[PDB]
Write an enzyme that holds these catalytic residues in place. Sequence first.
Site, mmCIF file in Angstrom:
data_model
loop_
_atom_site.group_PDB
_atom_site.id
_atom_site.type_symbol
_atom_site.label_atom_id
_atom_site.label_comp_id
_atom_site.label_asym_id
_atom_site.label_seq_id
_atom_site.Cartn_x
_atom_site.Cartn_y
_atom_site.Cartn_z
ATOM 1 N N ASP A 131 31.513 -2.671 5.401
ATOM 2 C CA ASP A 131 30.755 -2.280 4.352
ATOM 3 C C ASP A 131 31.133 -3.105 3.082
ATOM 4 O OD1 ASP A 131 33.517 -2.106 4.856
ATOM 5 O OD2 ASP A 131 33.604 0.098 4.658
HETATM 6 C C1 8Q1 Z 1 49.196 -2.555 -7.386
HETATM 7 C C2 8Q1 Z 1 48.756 -1.286 -5.812
HETATM 8 C C3 8Q1 Z 1 47.822 -0.022 -6.624
HETATM 9 C C4 8Q1 Z 1 46.573 0.269 -6.352
HETATM 10 C C5 8Q1 Z 1 46.141 1.556 -7.382
HETATM 11 C C6 8Q1 Z 1 44.441 1.952 -7.137
HETATM 12 C C7 8Q1 Z 1 44.679 2.470 -5.545
HETATM 13 C C8 8Q1 Z 1 43.020 3.266 -5.673
HETATM 14 C C9 8Q1 Z 1 42.587 3.688 -4.573
HETATM 15 C C10 8Q1 Z 1 41.849 4.650 -5.113
HETATM 16 C C11 8Q1 Z 1 40.475 4.932 -5.393
HETATM 17 C C12 8Q1 Z 1 39.120 5.326 -4.483
HETATM 18 O O1 8Q1 Z 1 39.492 5.312 -2.889
HETATM 19 S S1 8Q1 Z 1 37.292 5.580 -4.582
HETATM 20 C C13 8Q1 Z 1 36.360 6.884 -3.681
HETATM 21 C C14 8Q1 Z 1 36.261 5.802 -2.743
HETATM 22 N N1 8Q1 Z 1 35.272 7.118 -1.890
HETATM 23 C C15 8Q1 Z 1 34.114 7.074 -2.652
HETATM 24 O O2 8Q1 Z 1 33.797 6.956 -3.495
HETATM 25 C C16 8Q1 Z 1 33.291 8.332 -2.191
HETATM 26 C C17 8Q1 Z 1 32.129 7.444 -1.055
HETATM 27 N N2 8Q1 Z 1 32.775 6.333 -0.036
HETATM 28 C C18 8Q1 Z 1 32.775 4.926 0.119
HETATM 29 O O3 8Q1 Z 1 32.515 4.933 -0.806
HETATM 30 C C19 8Q1 Z 1 33.404 4.322 1.187
HETATM 31 O O4 8Q1 Z 1 33.520 3.389 0.673
HETATM 32 C C20 8Q1 Z 1 32.572 3.415 2.040
HETATM 33 C C21 8Q1 Z 1 31.768 5.291 2.600
HETATM 34 C C22 8Q1 Z 1 32.800 2.575 2.920
HETATM 35 C C23 8Q1 Z 1 31.222 3.420 0.840
HETATM 36 O O5 8Q1 Z 1 30.789 2.589 2.154
HETATM 37 P P1 8Q1 Z 1 30.572 0.731 1.075
HETATM 38 O O6 8Q1 Z 1 31.611 0.889 0.385
HETATM 39 O O7 8Q1 Z 1 30.058 -0.453 1.859
HETATM 40 O O8 8Q1 Z 1 30.215 0.805 0.017
#
Ligand code: 8Q1
Lengths: 83, 443, 387, 37, 157, 62, 253, 84
Positions: free
Chosen positions: H40
Amino acid sequence: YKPEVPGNTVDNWTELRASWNKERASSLGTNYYLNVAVMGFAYWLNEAYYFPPRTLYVGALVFFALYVRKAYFSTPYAFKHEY
Amino acid sequence: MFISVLLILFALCVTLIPEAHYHMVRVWSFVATIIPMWVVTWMWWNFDASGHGLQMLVILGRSHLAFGIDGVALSLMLLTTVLFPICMMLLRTVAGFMTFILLEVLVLSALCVLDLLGFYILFEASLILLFLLIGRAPYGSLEAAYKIVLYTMAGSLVLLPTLFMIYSECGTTNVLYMTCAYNHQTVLGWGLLAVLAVKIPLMPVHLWLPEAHVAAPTAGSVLLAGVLLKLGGIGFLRFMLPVVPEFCVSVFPLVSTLCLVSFLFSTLSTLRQIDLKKIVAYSSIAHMSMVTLAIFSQSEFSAYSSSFLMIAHGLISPALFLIVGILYDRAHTKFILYFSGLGASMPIGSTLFFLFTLGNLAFPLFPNFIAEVLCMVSIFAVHELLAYVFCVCQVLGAAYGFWAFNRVVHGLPRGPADVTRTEFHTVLPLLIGAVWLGIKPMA
Amino acid sequence: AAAAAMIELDLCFGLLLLILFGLLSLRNGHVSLAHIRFICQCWLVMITPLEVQDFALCILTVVLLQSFHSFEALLFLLLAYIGQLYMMHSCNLVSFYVCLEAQTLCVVVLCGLLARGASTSFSVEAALKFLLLSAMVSGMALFWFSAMYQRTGSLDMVGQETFWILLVMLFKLGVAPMHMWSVDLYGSIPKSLLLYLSTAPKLSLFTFWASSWHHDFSVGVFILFSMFIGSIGAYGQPALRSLFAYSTINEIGLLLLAVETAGFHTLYQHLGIYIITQLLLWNLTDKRLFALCAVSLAGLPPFAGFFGKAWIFWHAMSVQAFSLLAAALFCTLLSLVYYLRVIRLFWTAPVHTAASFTGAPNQTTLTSACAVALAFAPVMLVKPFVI
Amino acid sequence: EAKQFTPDGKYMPGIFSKAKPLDRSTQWVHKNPYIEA
Amino acid sequence: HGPAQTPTVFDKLVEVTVVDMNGIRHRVRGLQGQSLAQALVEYGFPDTYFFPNMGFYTQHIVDAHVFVPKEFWGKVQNVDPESDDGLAVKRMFRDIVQDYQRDTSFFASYITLGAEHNGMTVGIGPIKPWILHSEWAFAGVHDSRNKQFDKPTVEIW
Amino acid sequence: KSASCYAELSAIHKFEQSKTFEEQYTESCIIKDRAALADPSNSVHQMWEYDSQTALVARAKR
Amino acid sequence: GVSSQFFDAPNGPSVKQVLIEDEWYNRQRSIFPLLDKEPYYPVDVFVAPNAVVCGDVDIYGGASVFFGAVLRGDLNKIRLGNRSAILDRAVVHAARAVPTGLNAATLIGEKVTVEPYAVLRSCRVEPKVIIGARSVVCEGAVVESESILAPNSVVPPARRIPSGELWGGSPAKFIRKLTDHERDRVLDDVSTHYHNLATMFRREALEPGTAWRDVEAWRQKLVDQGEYEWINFREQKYLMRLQHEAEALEKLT
Amino acid sequence: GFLDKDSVTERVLHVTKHFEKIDASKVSPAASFEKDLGLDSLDVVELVMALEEEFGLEIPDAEADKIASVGDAINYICSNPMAK
Ligand SMILES: CCCCCCCCCCCC(=O)SCCNC(=O)CCNC(=O)[C@H](O)C(C)(C)COP(=O)(O)O
Ligand SMILES: CCCCCCCCCCCCCCCCCC(=O)O[C@@H](COC(=O)CCCCCCCCCCCCCCC)COP(=O)(O)OCC[N+](C)(C)C
C-alpha cells in the site's frame, strides 16, 4: 579554416580538473611567513652588496633556476593518507 | 615653425567636422596632406646648394627639439609628403585619417630633428599608433602588432640610458656639440646600433617585419615600407656616424657580416614564399642591407649613394604593395595559388606590375639601377670581394621576382577585372617619379 | 611663550567645533553633508605650513575629500591627515611611531566602514589581515627603537638598528616581498580608499625620508624584487584590481631606484606624475580615458609618464648603477604588454556610458578632464623644473 | 540584371531588390579548403 | 528551392532539464548556437548562480558550474590544458569550485546548445565565495531574488 | 484577456500621466534623498529611521 | 474595473490627479517610469521630443529613438543595442509570454535599423539587421544576424528568418542571399548613417530650452492674485498612507 | 546518467531484501509496487525512505508519489544530479 583542438575532450577536461578538489587556504599564513622571513633574515645580505659581480650574477641565476611558482602549484602530498 | 603650427592645426580640424558631411570630410583630410607636399617643394626651392650643410635652422630654447635641413632629410621629407596623400586615398574612416595625420606630423618632425633626445621623443611616439593600425580588430593581426611594438621598444630601451650617458658627459644632446666633445663611444655606439638595427631590418632582429608589413592595410604597408625603415638609415647618417666614428670603424667587421648574412639569408627565404605580400615584404630586407653596408663603407660618396637607394626603394616597393593591395581588395586573397592569367584580365595592372618588378630588380631606366651601381662603387672602394658578394647573387633576386610575376600573370585567365581610375591614380605619382629619377635625376 | 604655536591651538579648536557642528547637522536628518566637507577642506588649508611638500599633500587631500560622504569617514580622513602631515616633520622615532600608527588605525577603520553589498565581508577580511600584519611590523619598529635607545642613550637615528627601521618603512610602501597586504587590499576594498591609499601616504613617507633619514645600507634587492615581481604579476593576473596592484609594486620599485642612487628630484617628479594619474584612474566613468592612463603608465614618449621614468633612468645612468638600471629596463619592456592589454580592453571596444538618474550627473568629470591634461605638462617637465 | 544607377547618374544601393547587385565582393574567390589549410 | 517548410523557431528549439541547488526541476528552453549559460541567464535564475569567466579578454562572459551526465560528456567543447584558455579553466576550478568538484563538473559557457543536447538533464553545482571587484562579488549564500537577466551591464571594472 | 490587460495597463499609465509638475518635482527630490540614503554608512542611519516612500524621518531608531 | 490610485507605488500615492481635459498645455514626458520600472539609457542617446520611452527599457551606446516612435516596456522588458536606430513612429512592444516558451522580452542587437512605421513585439532581432518600412515582426519570432526584411512584410508568430538572406512578403518568403560585401559593410553603413543624423539633431538641441517661461509667467500671475496653492506633497503622501493602513485595519476585525 | 545502471540496481535490491513483508526471491529488476509486490502507500513510503537512506538524497512527496516501480526508483536515482 580553424585549427583542431588537440586531444580528447573528456581527457582534457580531467586534466583541467586535476589537483583542485581541495579547499584553498587563506593567504594570511603566506603573508605572515614572508614578513617574518624578511624581518628576521634579510640582514644576512648586507655584506653581499660588496661581493664580486660574477658571484652575484650566478647567485641570481641560481635563485631563478630553483624558484617554484606559486600559481598552479600542487603537491602529491595533498591527497595521500600517509607519508 | 609658424607654418608648421598652422599645418598641424588645419590637419587636426578633421575631428570637428560632423560625420554626416561625407564629401567635406574626404576633401578636408586629402587637402590636409596635399599642403605639406607644396611646403616641402618650396623648401627645396629655397635651399642653397652651394651654401652651408645645415640650412633653415630653428631651436626651441631649453626644450631640446632643434631642427635643420640637409640633403638626406630633404629628399626623405619630399618622399614622405608624396606618399601620405596616396595613403589618404586608401582609407575610409575618420580614425584612419587621424592616425595617418598624426603619423605624418611625427615622421616629418623626426626626419629633420638635430637633437638625440628629440629624435627619441618624436620617433617612438608612433608606437601605439602602429599597434592600433596593425592590430585592428576584424582584419588585422594582434600577433604582428605585438611583435613590431616589442622589438622597437626593446631597441629604444637599450638606447635610452646611453643617450642620457652622453647627455651627462658633455651637457647637451644637440648633435652639433655632441660631435665636438669627447665621449665614451663604445657604449653610445652600442645603444645607437641597437635602435637602428631594429628599425632597418638587420638579422637577427628582423622577424617583426614579415608579420607587420603583411598584416597592415595597404596604406599602412605603403607607409611602413616606403618611410619608416629609412629612419634607421637617416639615424646612421645624422646621429651615429658624426658622434661615434671610432665605434663606427671598429664595428665594421660585425656590421659587415650582419649585412652580408641578412642579404643572403633573406634572399634565400624570399624564394620559398607563397604569399604575394610576404614576397614583397621580404625583398625589402636585402635592399636595406645594401643600404647599411653602403652607409658604413664611408668610402667614395657614401651618403649620396645610400640616400639615393633609400629613395629608389621608397618609390618602387610601395607600388608593389599597391598592386598586391588592389588584388587583395577585389579578390579577397593574397595567395598565389588563386591567381593565374592576370595579363589577359588585368592588362594595365600587369603592365604596371612588370615595370615595378623590373624596377625592384635594379634594371636600367629605373632609379634602383643607378642606386645599386653607386652603392657598389662605395662598397668596392673598401674591398673588391664585399662588392663581389652582392654582384654574383643577382640571379637570386631575379629568380623570385620573375617566378612570382610568371606564376601570377601568365597562364589560364582567372581573377578580377582591370584597375579603376582611382587605383591608377594611386599608382601614377610613383611611376612618374621613377621615370624621372631613373632617366634624368640630376642637373 | 606659546605664541609660536597658534596653528596647533587652531587645529584643536577646529576639531572641537567641527564635531559639534556635525552633531547639530545630524540632529536635523540631513542626508548630505557638503557643508561639513567644505569646513573640513577649510580646516585642511588652515593647518598646513608654507612648504611645497606640505601644500602638495594639502591640495591632494582637499581633492580626495570629494569622494567621501559620511561624517565619520571625513573625521577619519582628517585624523589620518594629521599623522601624514606631522610625519614629514618628525625628527625622532617617537613621533614617527605615533604618526604611522594613527594612519594604520584610520585606514583599518575606513576599510571596515565603507564596504557595501556582497563585497562587505571580503573588505573586512582584508582589513583584518592588514591589521595583523601591521601589528608585528609595529612591534619590530618598537623593539629595534628600544635597542637603539639603549645603545646610544639618545634619540639619534644612527647605527646598525636603522636597518630594521628601514625595513619598517619599506613595509609601509608595499615593497616586495612584503607586498601582499596591498595586493589583498586592492582586490576587495572600494575604489575611493584605493585612490587614497596609492597617493597620500607614499608622499608623506618619502618626504620624511627626504627630510630626516640616513642609513648606511642598501635597498637594491628590494628594488629587484619589486620590479620583477610587480611586472610578472601584472602580466599574469587577469583581474584588473590585481593588475593595478602589481603595477603599483613595479612603480614603487622605480621610486626606490631613484632613492637608492640619491637624486630626489627625479623621485619627486615621477611621484607627482603618478599621483595625478592615480587621481585620473580611480575616478573614471568614460572608459576611453583608461587608455590615456595606459599610455602614460607605460612610459610612452610624448606623455608625462615617459618624463617621470626617464629622469629616473638618467640619474641612475649618471652615477653608474648599471645592474639595477638594466633590470629596470627589462621590467619596463615587460610592463608595456599589460598596458597594451588595458588598451585592447577599453579602447578597441564600443562606447557605452550610462547616464545618471538620481541626479549628480557624472559628478567628477571636472577632475578627470583636468587630470587628462597631463599631455600639456611635458613642456614644463623638460626644463630644469623639479630641482 | 540589376539596375544600380538612375538614367541621370545617382547610384542606388538596391538593399531590398531581388536582383543581385554587382559590388566589391563580386569577384571574391571561392576558397578551396585544402589550399586554405 | 520549392514548397519546403518555412523556418520556425520550433525547429531550432533545444529543451534542457535543469535541477537547481534546492532540488527543484526546471524546464529550460534555448536556441541552437546559444551557449548554456546564456539560456540559464534568460530563464531567470538568480545572480548568485553566475560568475565571471576568469580568462583575459572574456570576463564580460557569465558562467555557471553545471553537472553533466556521462552520455553528454563528449559534447562539451574541447579545451587545450596547455593553452591560455586551459589556464582560464584551471583558474576557475582552482578558485570558484574548489572542493565542490566532481567528475561531472563543467562550465556552462563551454556548452553550445545543439540538437544533441535535446533532452539532456543538468544540475547546478555549488560554488565558493569569490570577488571580482566591489560591484560584483558573492558572499557565499544563495539568498537573493535578483535575477542575473535584470542587470543592464556586466562590468569588468 | 487582451481587453482586460489593456484596462489594467491604462490604469497604471493614467496614474503616471496625471501627476502635476509640483508632485513630479517633489518625487524627483524624494528619489534623490532615497539614493543618498542607500549608503549604509550614512551617518543618519544610527539615529533616524526614514519612511520608504517619502524619505521623511518617521521615528527615532534608538 | 481598475482604480487609478496606487498606494504601493515606489514614491507613494498620487495626492492630486489632473483630468486630461483640464490641461491647457501638452505635458507629455518623453522618458518616464511606470511604478518601479525605470528606463535605462546612455549619456549620448537621442530621444526625439515627440517620442515616448516608458517602463522597463534598456538603451545602450549610440542608439537613437526618432520622431514619434514608441518603446513601451510595461508588460515585459525591451533592450535596444549599441548604435541601433528606431526610426520615425515605429512601435516596439512586448508580451508577457510567447508560444515558444522562451523569454518574452524584445531584444534588439547592436547595429540594427528599424525603418518607419514598423512594429516589433516580443521578437528577437540579432545584430546587423534592416527591418523595412510598414513591416510587422510578431510575437516569439526570430530574425537572425546579418539579414534584411523587405518593406511591408509580415513575419508570423514563432517564425524564423535565416541568417545572411533577404526575406520579404506577407507572409515572408525567400528573396535572395545577401552578398558578402553587404554583410561586411552595408548594414554597418546604414546604422552609422542614422547615428550621424541623430548626432546632427543632438548637437543643436537646447535643453531644457525656454518654453517654461510662459508657464512660469502664468504661475507668477497666480502667486500675484493669491490663488497659487502650496501643497506639502511629502506630508500628504504620508498621511494618505496612514489613513489607508487605518482603513485596512478597521475592516478585518 | 549521473551514475551507472548496475550498482544502483543491486543496491536497490539490497535494500529491498531486508523488508519483512516482501519476498527475498520474488523481487525482480523490473516489477511493480502495487500489483506485483503487494504494497500500500505507507509501505511504498517506507521503501522510498530506505532508498533515500542508502543513496543519501531527499525525495519530495510528489516525486515519491510518482515512484511506483523498481525501474522508476532506479531511473529517478540515475537522473538525480546529487546522487552518491
Ligand atoms: C514518536 C512516535 C509518535 C507517533 C505518533 C503519530 C501516530 C499517528 C497515528 C494516527 C494517524 C492515523 O492513523 S490516520 C487514519 C488512517 N486511516 C484512514 O485514513 C481511513 C482510511 N484507511 C487508510 O487510509 C489506510 O491507510 C489504507 C486502507 C491502507 C489506505 O491505503 P493507502 O495507504 O495505500 O492509501
Ligand atoms: C646627401 C645628398 C642628397 C642626395 C640624396 C639623393 C636624392 C635622390 C634623387 C637625386 C636627385 C639629385 C638632385 C640634384 C640637384 C637638386 C638640388 C641639390 O643640390 O640637392 C640638394 C637636395 O636634393 C634633394 O632634396 C633632392 C630631392 C630628391 C627626392 C625625390 C623623390 C621625391 C619625388 C617623388 C615623386 C614625385 C612625382 C610627382 C609628380 C606627379 C642638396 O644636395 P647636395 O648638392 O649634395 O647638397 C650640397 C651640400 N652642401 C650644402 C654642404 C654644399
